[PDB]
Enzyme design. Structure first.
Site: not given
Lengths: 45, 144, 777, 144, 144
Positions: C300, C419
């Protein structure tokens, strides 16, 4: 007194209640272990 | 020369003094503060010579014996000197009987115990300070 | 004064006394303490024969026999300590081979008992051999008999003696059962714990609530509701991990042409290239067909060093123009370009092992509905969850089938824990998840942070995708998710537990209306059996109520992040306020102990212990709050592995690598090796039956400890190095918690506001003074 | 000097005196506190030579036996010399019966237990100090 | 050695006395505190050689058994072989019935509980000191 009858009968015997509890634990463990093995086979395959 | 270095205390005399205190507390002896304190000072005087020390002990031992005899109620030394002929002429058995009667074995036992106690305490506390303090306190009490 | 002793005492004894006094004075003892010490010593010499050989042998090891008394430094009340320690020595305890062998053989026989029982049941393999109706009838009568017996033992009133006998017998039965291994033992212990807990709850509901004084009634109702909630959470936890699946890998077809395509993802934002280099090298080292695996780096930050490294080593590199939704958004953006049938996701710090995908993907090619597979980050909860199809994603070390993943529109981005929410969404569509407890591979501040975000993510998962009212979930999965949410909510019960003893000691209520001994005879069995059964289920080497105190104090610390979801607080006012109430409760309790009626006296004592427990737990929460921000060490794993060293002279030195890192290795060489710094040496590293030679230069030599640094390596050399190094096939606790609570209180006195700083400092001072007299071995 | 090296204490004789204490509490003893203090002082007195200490103990064993005889109400030796003719005339079985009537086995067991307790307690408690303290207290009471 | 580490303790005999203490609380014992103290002293006697230690314990075992025989209300030997003829004349079934009636299994369970407690305590705490203290307590109560 139907339910106070059994309490009076077994009040003075902790040994007997301990043996009965051990028997119930082992027995219920056997049935639960059978069921859980069945479910484990059903899920693994 | 230096004087204070010779102040070793009464030493053996200490026991003797305490013995008198015992006979003073048992009431069997007539304590004289003057002569006893004089004897204590005479033995306590710092003499630079060792020869003077031994000579003073040699002079004081018979003087001390005579003082002990005088402090008792037995006949005086002059009277016993005059009567020594008869005393030696007297029967041995009666003399032994008189000696045994005079000797109180309780006093001998207490004196042996005090001897052992003095020998034990002559290793921890200086007995000289306490003996002289008791002598001075007895003098002060007699004064009042 | 020296003059007084000089005149009173003979010079030898005066000199010895002066020597002893001066020796005591030089070691920091005051004159009064020194004089008291000489007085006590001369008394000891006059009474106790210290010259006897027994007493000489006592004196020579004084330090070991009297650890807390300093012989060279007297201090007042030291004779009290001497008497206490001598009493302890008088009370405490100070053919061996045959007895030890018999005992050990007895445990070993009892440990092999399950194998023998299994073999004997195997030869009579066999309900299962009866008809369906007969099976149902027999099982029904069996279950009804067992349950009625259990209910009778649950609801049986006893006197103290019969009750105590029952507790002793059940505790002994649990102790014998715990030793024997196997899942049947776990089930038996679970049933015992359930029976004892039901007995306790029955007694509390039927005999302990006070209906006469309304204040005591309300307090008892709140405390009993808290106890009921805790018991429900314990039962749910028992059910979650009742039967771990213990899944084993199903081998892939021997024909490699039938194997699928996998895309490995490594998303990084701020990690240094040192961290990601190991992950990418190990990912390249994974055993899998080259055309059937593609590696992606998702940086990123757009670091150019990462780009150059990826191009040199060949792995794919993709960066994002925009950075919405953090890691989940990064993975979703990357998923538009991957074309494989499976996607593996790895954290930057997690090193993938070579045997990873071969061990994992057999289940994917076997079970069609399996959309998720998870491997351990470093437990037993996931193994139990896999039984109920409730294993949830942990963000890394997992493989997800591509088609189901694209069906739900990619990784969920509506929660912080993407998740778990992705696992929920996979489950709701009817897909299955798996878990293999096979090894495939820090700072407690990150631990607390990850617990915080897990709690908040579960809160939002319940908020947005409520499992209870949602569709598509089986009952067991709902129970698992609800159990997680409940376990993340255990703050109110802990507050009630902390406040209730004060509700008795201050208000003089009777929150639990029963004799104190009765209280101990229904409660202590409950915690004893719960702890024993949990210890068996987890299987931890260290296991006790002390260990449980440890998680209770590390779970009371995140009470207000989780509560807000619906370091800073532990020093704030509303906390020292509670601690001060618990403290004044102790003084009021001492008042009741001395000035109250004797009939209630024992009750007060009980609350003492309870308050003491609270005083520990609170003291724990502050302690971790300062020890969270104190860890300074970094990644350093010391493992033994036989390496070899060859000099420029060629003298082969087999060695053991002590520590390792990308910068170099520190090794232990067996024997005397005159290795000089700067000497070009060959390090032979062992990978299975293969040996790889890496040329190194010696940078530091600490005797047998030799440090070697790497010259600029190559791609293949780097992969081999990462494969050989990282991608390997790999009463006391009560005292420790007491020290933890004490250090928490000391830090609280150090860092609290001044107005309570003073009080806490005073309290710590007298606590240390009181502990100063405690007997020690 | 190091005169403490010659103050060895009573040692085994402690048990001796301890035995008497029991017989004092049991009324079997006619106590003579001054003689007990004399014996303690004699056994405690420091003799520089080890051989002299051993010889003192060997001499004191008969003296201790005689003192113990004097402390009990048993007949004197002269009575035994006078009545030996009567004693020898009695049959052996009669003497056995008489002595078995005399031997109080409770006191023998108490002696055994006290011996064991003394051997265990000589490690931790100075028995000689306590024995001498008790003797001094008894003498003080029997005097004042 | 010279410091006499031969005070090895009672060990297993500890439980022995513990049992008697329990039976003293149950009232089935005609207790003899003096003989128990003498037995404890005999077992606690420091013997240097290990062979003599084993010999002492081996002779003490029948002595302890006879002492337990004596301290109970079970009848002396004369009654035992006086009723042995009747026992022999009785049927085996009568003997088994008498055996089943004689045992109070509750005290057997209590004794087993005491055995487990004694093993655990001896693992953790020296019980010999407590047993000896209780023995002197019983003797002191009986004496006064």
């Amino acid at each position: 007194p139907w339910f106070e009858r059994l309490w009076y009968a077994l009040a003075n015997h902790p040994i007997l209640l301990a043996v009965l509890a051990a028997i119930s634990v082992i027995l219920l463990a056997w049935v639960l272990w059978r069921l859980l093995r069945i479910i484990s086979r059903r899920r693994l395959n | 020369s230096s004087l204070w270095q010779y102040w070793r205390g009464l030493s053996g005399w200490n026991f003797y003094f305490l013995v008198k205190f015992g006979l003073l507390w048992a009431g069997y002896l007539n304590f004289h503060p003057l002569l006893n304190l004089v004897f204590a000072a005479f033995l306590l005087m710092p003499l630079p010579r060792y020869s003077l020390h031994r000579l003073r002990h040699w002079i004081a031992l018979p003087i001390g014996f005579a003082l002990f005899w005088h402090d008792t109620w037995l006949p005086g030394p002059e009277s016993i000197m005059s009567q020594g002929s008869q005393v030696a002429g007297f029967s041995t058995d009666y003399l032994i009987d008189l000696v045994t009667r005079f000797i109180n074995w309780q006093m001998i036992g207490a004196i042996f115990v005090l001897l052992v106690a003095w020998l034990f305490l002559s290793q921890w506390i200086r007995i000289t300070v306490f003996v002289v303090a008791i002598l001075l306190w007895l003098n002060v009490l007699t004064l009042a | 004064m020296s003059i007084l002793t000089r005149w009173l005492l003979i010079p030898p004894v005066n000199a010895r006394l002066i020597g002893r006094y001066r020796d005591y004075r030089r070691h920091g003892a005051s004159a009064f303490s020194a004089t008291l010490g000489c007085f006590w010593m001369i008394l000891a010499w006059i009474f106790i024969p210290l010259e006897h050989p027994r007493w000489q042998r006592i004196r020579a090891e004084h330090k070991n026999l009297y650890p807390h008394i300093n012989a060279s430094r007297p201090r007042p009340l030291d004779p009290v300590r001497y008497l206490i320690q001598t009493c302890w020595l008088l009370i405490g305890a100070s053919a061996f081979s045959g007895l030890q062998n018999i005992r050990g053989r007895y445990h070993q026989w009892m440990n092999e008992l399950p194998e023998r029982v299994s073999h004997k049941t195997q030869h009579l393999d066999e309900l299962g051999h009866l008809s369906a109706g007969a099976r149902r009838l027999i099982l029904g009568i069996i279950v009804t008999f067992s349950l009625i017996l259990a209910l009778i033992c649950v609801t049986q009133p006893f006197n103290p003696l019969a009750q105590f006998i029952f507790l002793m017998l059940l505790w002994g039965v649990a102790l014998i059962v715990r030793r024997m291994p196997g899942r049947f033992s776990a089930l038996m212990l679970i049933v015992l714990s359930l029976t004892v807990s039901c007995r306790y709850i029955w007694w509390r509901y039927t005999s302990t609530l006070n209906w006469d004084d309304p204040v005591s009634l309300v307090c008892g109702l709140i405390l009993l509701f808290a106890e009921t909630y805790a018991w429900i959470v314990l039962v749910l936890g028992y059910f979650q991990v009742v039967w771990p699946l213990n899944r084993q890998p199903v081998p892939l077809p021997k024909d490699m042409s039938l194997w699928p395509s996998v895309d490995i993802f490594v998303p990084t934002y701020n990690e240094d290239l040192n961290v990601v280099k190991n992950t990418i090298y190990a990912s390249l080292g994974i055993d899998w067909p080259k055309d059937k695996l593609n590696i992606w780096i998702l940086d990123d930050g757009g670091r150019e060093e990462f780009r150059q490294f990826a191009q040199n080593v060949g792995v794919k590199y993709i960066a994002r123009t925009t950075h919405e939704h953090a890691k989940a958004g990064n993975i979703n953006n990357a998923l538009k370009y991957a074309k494989g049938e499976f996607v593996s996701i790895f954290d930057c710090d997690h090193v993938p092992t070579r045997s990873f995908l071969q061990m994992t993907m057999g289940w994917f090619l076997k079970e069609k509905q399996l959309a998720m597979m998870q491997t351990p980050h470093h437990g037993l909860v996931q193994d139990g969850n896999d039984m109920w199809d409730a294993t949830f994603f942990c963000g890394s070390c997992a493989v997800i089938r591509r088609k189901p993943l694209d069906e739900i529109g990619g990784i969920a981005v509506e929660t912080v824990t993407e998740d778990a929410h992705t696992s929920l969404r996979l489950h709701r569509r009817g897909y299955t998840s798996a878990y293999m407890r096979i090894p495939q591979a820090e700072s407690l501040s990150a631990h607390i942070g990850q617990r915080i975000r897990w709690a908040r993510g579960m809160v939002q998962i319940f908020r947005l995708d409520n499992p209870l009212t949602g569709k598509g979930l089986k009952f067991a999965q709902r129970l698992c998710y609800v159990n997680a949410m409940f376990h993340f909510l255990s703050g109110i019960p802990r507050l009630i537990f902390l406040t209730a003893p004060l509700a008795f000691l201050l208000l003089h209520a009777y929150i639990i209306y029963a004799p104190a001994l009765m209280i101990a005879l229904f409660v202590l069995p409950h915690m004893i059996h719960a702890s024993l059964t949990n210890s068996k289920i987890q299987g931890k080497y260290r296991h006790s109520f002390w260990s449980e105190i440890y998680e209770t104090v590390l779970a009371w610390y995140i009470a207000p992040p989780t509560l807000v979801a619906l370091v800073d607080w532990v020093i704030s006012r509303p906390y020292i306020f509670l601690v001060l109430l618990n403290l004044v409760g102790v003084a009021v309790g001492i008042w009741r102990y001395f000035y109250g009626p004797p009939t209630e006296m024992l009750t007060v004592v009980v609350s003492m212990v309870w308050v003491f427990y609270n005083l520990i737990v609170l003291g724990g929460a502050v302690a971790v709050s300062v020890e969270s921000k104190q860890v300074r060490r970094s990644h350093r794993v010391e493992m033994t592995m036989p390496a070899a060293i060859a000099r420029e002279d060629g003298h082969l030195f087999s060695c053991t690598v002590q520590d390792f890192s990308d910068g170099g290795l520190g090794i232990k060489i067996n024997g005397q090796a005159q290795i000089l710094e700067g000497q070009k040496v060959n390090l032979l590293l062992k990978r299975g039956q293969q040996e790889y030679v890496f040329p190194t230069q010696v940078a530091r030599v600490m005797g047998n400890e030799v440090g070697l640094k790497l010259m600029p390596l190559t791609t293949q050399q780097h992969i081999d190095f990462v494969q050989c190094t990282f991608a390997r096939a790999d009463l006391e606790s009560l005292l420790d918690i007491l020290k933890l609570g004490f250090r928490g209180y000391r830090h609280l006195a150090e860092f609290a506001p001044s107005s309570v700083k003073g009080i806490f400092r005073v309290l710590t001072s007298l606590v240390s003074w009181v502990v100063s007299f405690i007997p020690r071995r």
